[PDB]
Nucleic acid binder design. Structure first.
Ligand SMILES: Nc1ncnc2c1ncn2[C@H]1CC[C@@H](COP(=O)(O)OP(=O)(O)OP(=O)(O)O)O1
Ligand SMILES: OC[C@H]1O[C@@](CO)(O[C@H]2O[C@H](CO)[C@@H](O)[C@H](O)[C@H]2O)[C@@H](O)[C@@H]1O
Ligand SMILES: [Zn+2]
Ligand SMILES: [Zn+2]
Length: 580
DNA sequence: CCTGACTCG
DNA sequence: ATTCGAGTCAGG
């Protein structure tokens, strides 16, 4: 803890070496249009702190920032890249991202600052961010010298930690996972975030008014049915009305009291019609609070765009998440909610929304991985297993399978492969438990390869202490040897699920990198706006739709070669709603 | 601040 | 207790 560094006030030539650790500090969690509070560089010639106003106004520094041949090592380069994009500066030449490296080594660590990454190698010459900026309403940039030393320490850590992290990734066979997948993807995500998605706010505001009226109506119906006014949004007050005043049966309690989950309420529908109204009220209330009001709070008023942040270093399986706002959970399953999507529109005149989605994605992945002949046979024959299972569950013909039953069948197919118990299945479909068990038994009968697989991967997990995906992403499962049934069971189902969802996440990630290449290749103007786990959403000039219809599905289907083909459904239209 | 509700994959 | 992976919100 005694680090020499230059508190510079002008950019020098020795600050612009072709290999360096770089820190461009954004203290605001949401980095969109956020202030950059300081800059630090460590390279073969020394350690430098630069004030942003100086460095960013200097053509020589900016030129360096922009130069691909000049290699930078950073922590969370996407944060830097975007916060720079907002200041009109380009960042290139990022050859190592310590956030992504640490996330690949172990997602459970929840590394979200340099100090946490440093710890993985017992490097302690740097402090946690929170310790320097403080927490909550106390959060503040500290005095220049103190700030300066912190940024410099972070760059020095990055500088020291590159080789050792690359070393361990190399051992794990994750070196290409970092350098060829996560890092390139990071630039693509940065472009998507910066571009944003345009919102029809007049539409959103109109729906909000209508929603408020209907909410008022349902609310009053509920008080009438209840004989009393109460806070329907209080599971606590509600449970009193349901289970104490109306005396409905108690199907379930949690640590806090009576459960009023949708699952429970749906089961109580035979006893009292108030329950259906409550379910409807909470659906509508969510639409209004979150997808009208929340969405309107974060739209940028002059451009009418929303700029999400895709957290690339968060999920245990390798999936992305989306925050502030979450654009991966926009309603679709109920017609009333789905209309929210009419407000998501192209950013240019005469452009349209194109959307492409992997069909049955994880089932295809599992079929490749488990090498089940029946499943792989079902797929080379292009059956729709969701519809099929649906036909089975509701005892109906292909044509009597509504989009809604197909969604139920989907959770059942995935539920079973991912280790749902007879209880959960019976509870899910409100059917008999003995029936549930037999249905499962029958499922494994039908796909014994999948049955062998799930048994094997749990054994493997027990011996190795972790599982892996197609592209060698890894998840550690220490609890898999736990003496506790509950704890151990959770780990075992993680071992069943992670390799498949993680592989699917690997696949779409590679698909995105390839697609970006093929786009820029053919000089198409089309660009990615969103990823939603197994779908990609683009906007593009209407003329391009013809090209896209061949290109996007090809790229997505050929991103990897599996024992079975991949299938991509696609559609386009004037709004996200219409791309169906 | 946590829980339990809703939303999606 | 009892498929898996996420985020946001009101209420408490
Ligand atoms: N209920 C669920 N349980 C576990 N995993 C799920 C569930 N629903 C979705 N997933 C995971 C598995 C499939 C992946 C993509 O979701 P999606 O709704 O597009 O399923 P799918 O690709 O099998 O069906 P579709 O042919 O309609 O696109 O997300
Ligand atoms: O740039 C996102 C990156 O930052 C981390 C921690 O450094 O998370 C921060 O930023 C997120 C996006 O704004 C916030 O949701 C999060 O709460 C905040 O800590 C990483 O988790 C993430 O990869
Ligand atoms: Zn799909
Ligand atoms: Zn999808």
């Amino acid at each position: 803890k005694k680090m020499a560094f230059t508190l510079a006030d002008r950019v020098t030539e020795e600050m612009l070496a072709d290999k360096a650790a770089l820190v461009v500090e954004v203290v605001e969690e949401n980095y969109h249009d956020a202030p950059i509070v300081g800059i630090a560089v460590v390279n073969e010639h020394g350690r430098f702190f630069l004030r942003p106003e100086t460095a960013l106004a200097d053509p020589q520094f900016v030129a360096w920032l922009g130069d691909e041949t000049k290699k930078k090592s950073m922590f969370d380069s996407k944060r830097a890249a975007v916060a720079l994009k907002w200041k009109g500066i380009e960042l290139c030449g990022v050859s190592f991202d310590l956030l992504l490296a640490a996330y690949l080594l172990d997602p459970a660590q929840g590394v979200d600052d340099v100090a946490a990454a440093a710890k993985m190698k017992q490097y302690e010459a740097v402090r946690p961010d929170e310790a320097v900026y403080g927490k909550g309403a106390k959060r503040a940039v500290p005095d220049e010298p103190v700030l300066a030393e912190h940024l410099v320490r972070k760059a020095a850590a990055i500088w020291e930690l590159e080789r050792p992290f690359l070393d361990e990734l190399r051992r794990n066979e994750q070196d290409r996972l970092l350098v060829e997948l996560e890092q390139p993807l990071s630039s693509i995500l940065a472009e998507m975030e910066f571009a944003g998605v345009k919102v029809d706010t007049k539409r959103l505001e109109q729906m909000g008014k209508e929603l408020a009226e209907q909410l008022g109506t349902v609310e009053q119906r509920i008080y009438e049915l209840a004989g009393q006014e109460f806070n329907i949004n209080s599971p606590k007050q509600l449970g009193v009305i349901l289970f104490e005043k109306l005396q409905l049966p108690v199907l379930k309690k949690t640590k806090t009291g009576y459960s009023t989950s949708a699952d429970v309420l749906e089961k109580l529908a035979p006893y009292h019609e108030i329950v259906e109204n409550i379910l409807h009220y909470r659906q509508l209330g969510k639409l209004q609070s979150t997808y009208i009001e929340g969405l309107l709070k974060v739209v940028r008023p002059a451009t009418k765009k929303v700029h999400t942040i895709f957290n690339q270093a968060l999920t245990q399986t390798g999936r992305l998440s989306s925050t502030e706002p979450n654009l991966q959970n926009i309603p679709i399953r109920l017609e009333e909610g789905r209309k929210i999507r009419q407000a998501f529109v192209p950013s240019e005149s005469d452009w349209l929304i194109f959307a492409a989605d992997y069909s049955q994605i994880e089932l295809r992945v599992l079929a490749h991985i488990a090498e089940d002949d029946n499943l792989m046979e079902a797929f080379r024959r292009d059956l729709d297993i969701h519809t099929k299972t649906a036909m089975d569950i509701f005892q109906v013909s292909e044509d009597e399978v509504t989009p809604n039953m197909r969604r139920q069948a989907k959770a059942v197919n995935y539920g079973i492969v991912y280790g749902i118990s007879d209880y959960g299945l019976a509870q899910n479909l409100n059917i008999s438990r003995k029936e549930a068990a037999e249905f499962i038994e029958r499922y494994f009968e039908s796909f014994p390869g999948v049955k062998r697989y799930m048994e094997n991967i749990v054994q493997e997990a027990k011996q190795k202490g972790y599982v892996t995906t197609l592209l060698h992403r890894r998840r550690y499962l220490p609890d898999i040897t736990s003496r506790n049934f509950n704890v151990r069971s959770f780990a075992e189902r993680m071992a069943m699920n992670t390799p498949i969802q993680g592989s699917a996440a690997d696949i779409i990630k590679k698909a995105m990198i390839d697609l970006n290449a093929r786009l820029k290749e053919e000089r198409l103007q089309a660009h990615l706006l969103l990823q939603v786990h197994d779908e990609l959403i683009l906007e593009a000039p209407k003329e391009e739709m013809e090209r896209l219809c061949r290109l996007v599905p090809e790229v997505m289907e050929q991103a990897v070669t599996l024992r079975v083909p991949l299938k991509v459904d696609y559609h386009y239209g004037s709004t996200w709603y219409d791309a169906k």
